[PDB]
Design an enzyme around this catalytic site. Structure first.
Site, PDB file in Angstrom:
ATOM      1  N   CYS A 166       0.870  -1.314  -0.058  1.00 25.88           N
ATOM      2  CA  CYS A 166      -0.086   0.026   0.003  1.00 25.88           C
ATOM      3  C   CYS A 166       0.916   1.321  -0.080  1.00 25.88           C
ATOM      4  O   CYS A 166       0.631   2.280  -0.682  1.00 25.88           O
ATOM      5  CB  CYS A 166      -0.880   0.010   1.118  1.00 25.88           C
ATOM      6  N   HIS A 209      -5.588  -2.510  13.888  1.00 29.65           N
ATOM      7  CA  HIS A 209      -6.364  -2.498  15.195  1.00 29.65           C
ATOM      8  C   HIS A 209      -7.516  -3.479  15.125  1.00 29.65           C
ATOM      9  O   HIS A 209      -7.657  -4.129  14.020  1.00 29.65           O
ATOM     10  CB  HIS A 209      -7.168  -0.701  15.138  1.00 29.65           C
TER      11      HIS A 209
END
Length: 146
Positions: free
Chosen positions: A53, A136
């Site tokens: 990414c 997360h």
């Protein structure tokens, strides 16, 4: 702790911060991480195809091909800094970005939950902004499925 870096067969010379190895007009604290010069050993480390990414973001911002970004990294970091073990799953870090910023003359405002951090070079000819969301956990429904 520089154990892996001192043992890296693709490294040479003394350990120092990247901003000392490749001096430039860095935006503090860009390039503070410890590294060594890369010697002649050709990197086996494959392009992080499933965790690319950061390369994609920089490529879209600059028109630089991702393979060129990757080639530049492979020529300028030793394998133990290129892949600390997590590259194939977690991808590149802002340490890697420091190298791309030095070579390609970049500066980027990274936007994250706890605050912005601009990294790169004070004299960069390309400037852009990237949102960084850290890993997360989120509670989901009992039978949640991707």
């Amino acid at each position: 702790d520089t154990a892996r870096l001192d043992a890296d067969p693709s490294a040479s010379g003394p350990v120092m911060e990247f901003r000392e190895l490749q001096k430039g007009a860095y935006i503090e604290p860009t390039g503070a991480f410890l590294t060594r010069a890369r010697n002649s050993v050709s990197s086996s480390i494959p392009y992080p195809a499933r965790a690319a990414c950061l390369l994609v973001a920089v490529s879209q911002a600059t028109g630089l091909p991702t393979r060129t970004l990757w080639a530049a990294l492979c020529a300028n970091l030793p394998d133990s800094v290129l892949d600390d073990g997590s590259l194939a799953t977690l991808g590149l870090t802002t340490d890697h970005f420091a190298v791309l910023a030095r070579i390609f003359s970049l500066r980027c405002r990274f936007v994250s939950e706890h605050g912005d951090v601009e990294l790169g070079l004070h004299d960069a000819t390309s400037r852009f902004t990237i949102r960084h969301t850290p890993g997360h956990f989120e509670l989901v429904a009992d039978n949640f499925s991707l």
